[PDB]
Every structure is written in C-alpha cells, then in structure tokens.
Amino acid sequence: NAVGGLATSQIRDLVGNPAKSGKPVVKMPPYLKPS
Amino acid sequence: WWDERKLLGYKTIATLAVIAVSSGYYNRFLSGLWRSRRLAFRPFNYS
Ligand SMILES: CCCCCCCCCCCCCCCCCC(=O)OC[C@H](COP(=O)([O-])OCC(O)COP(=O)([O-])OC[C@@H](COC(=O)CCCCCCCCCCCCCCCCC)OC(=O)CCCCCCCCCCCCCCCCC)OC(=O)CCCCCCCCCCCCCCCCC
Numbered sequence: 001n002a003v004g005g006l007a008t009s010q011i012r013d014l015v016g017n018p019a020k021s022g023k024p025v026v027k028m029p030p031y032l033k034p035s
Numbered sequence: 036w037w038d039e040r041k042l043l044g045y046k047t048i049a050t051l052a053v054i055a056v057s058s059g060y061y062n063r064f065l066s067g068l069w070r071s072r073r074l075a076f077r078p079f080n081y082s
Pocket residue numbers: 052053055056057058059060062063066
C-alpha cells in the first residue's frame with residue numbers, strides 16, 4: 001500500500017479529488033413547470 | 036385576326052406552361068433546405 005514510505009493512495013483521496021463547483025441552480029417559476 | 040389570335044394563344048400558353056413546370060420544380064427543390072430544418076435548445080439548470 002505504501003509506495004516508498006508514502007500512503008500515496010490515501011494522500012490522493014485527500015488531495016487528488018477536489019470538489020467541482022457547477023452552474024448555479026435557477027429557481028423555476030411555478031408557471032413554467034409544465035414541460 | 037381570329038385564327039392568328041387563336042394560334043398565338045395556344046403557343047403562348049404552351050411556353051408559359053413549360054416555364055411554370057420547370058420553375059415550380061426548382062422552387063420546391065430550393066425550399067427543401069428550409070422545410071427540413073431542425074432546432075435544439077440547450078436546457079437551463081432549473082431546480
Ligand atoms: C400543367 C402545366 C401548367 C400548370 C403547371 C402548374 C404547376 C405544376 C406543378 C409543378 C411541376 C413540377 C412537379 C411538381 C413540383 C412540386 C410542386 C411545385 O412546383 O411547387 C412549387 C412551390 C413550392 O412551394 P413550397 O416552397 O413547397 O411551399 C408552398 C407550400 O407552403 C408547401 O407546403 P407543403 O409542402 O407542406 O404542402 C402543401 C402543398 C401545397 O401545394 C399544393 O396543394 C399544390 C398541389 C394542389 C393539387 C393537388 C392534387 C392532388 C390532391 C389529392 C387530394 C388531397 C386531399 C385534399 C382534401 C383533404 C380533405 C381532408 O405543397 C405541395 O403540394 C408541394 C408539392 C408536393 C409534391 C411534390 C412533387 C411530387 C412529384 C410529382 C408527381 C406526384 C405523383 C403523381 C404522378 C404524376 C402526375 C402528373 O409551390 C407553391 O408555391 C404552391 C403552389 C400552389 C399555390 C396555390 C395557392 C395560391 C394562393 C394565391 C396566389 C395566387 C393569387 C391569384 C390566383 C387567381 C388569379 C385569378
């Protein structure tokens with residue numbers, strides 16, 4: 001598991017996967033609900 | 036001018052008919068670009 005003394009996988013899971021911020025959600029007026 | 040008039044009428048109508056047929060085909064051919072258009076809209080990110 002440790003590659004040269006480093007738990008790289010663990011580090012990856014803590015460093016290599018930042019969260020991605022997507023488009024803001026638009027609140028739908030009730031009269032636009034019908035498809 | 037009775038006979039000359041009748042004959043000229045026949046010939047003029049025949050030639051105009053040929054022109055009408057050809058131009059009608061060409062018009063319907065050109066309109067095929069617009070009569071088959073398609074639209075698509077990228078949806079918004081609603082709740
Ligand atoms: C004989 C020589 C002399 C006369 C020549 C006359 C012209 C002959 C035709 C041309 C020859 C070449 C071959 C055909 C080419 C295609 C047709 C063509 O040329 O289209 C050109 C051109 C193409 O237009 P477009 O860009 O497609 O858009 C027009 C439509 O919006 C388009 O809308 P759409 O496409 O969604 O559909 C609506 C419909 C509108 O057009 C019409 O309605 C025109 C036809 C009307 C007669 C239909 C007869 C059959 C009906 C059967 C029953 C149906 C049900 C009806 C009832 C239902 C009830 C529930 O459109 C068409 O019909 C387009 C043509 C479709 C067929 C394509 C060709 C197929 C191959 C041909 C052979 C087919 C098999 C038969 C075997 C061979 C037989 C010889 O057509 C027109 O511009 C329309 C012409 C008719 C206009 C009539 C209204 C006039 C309004 C007022 C203006 C004038 C004011 C002053 C008048 C009074 C003065 C005193």
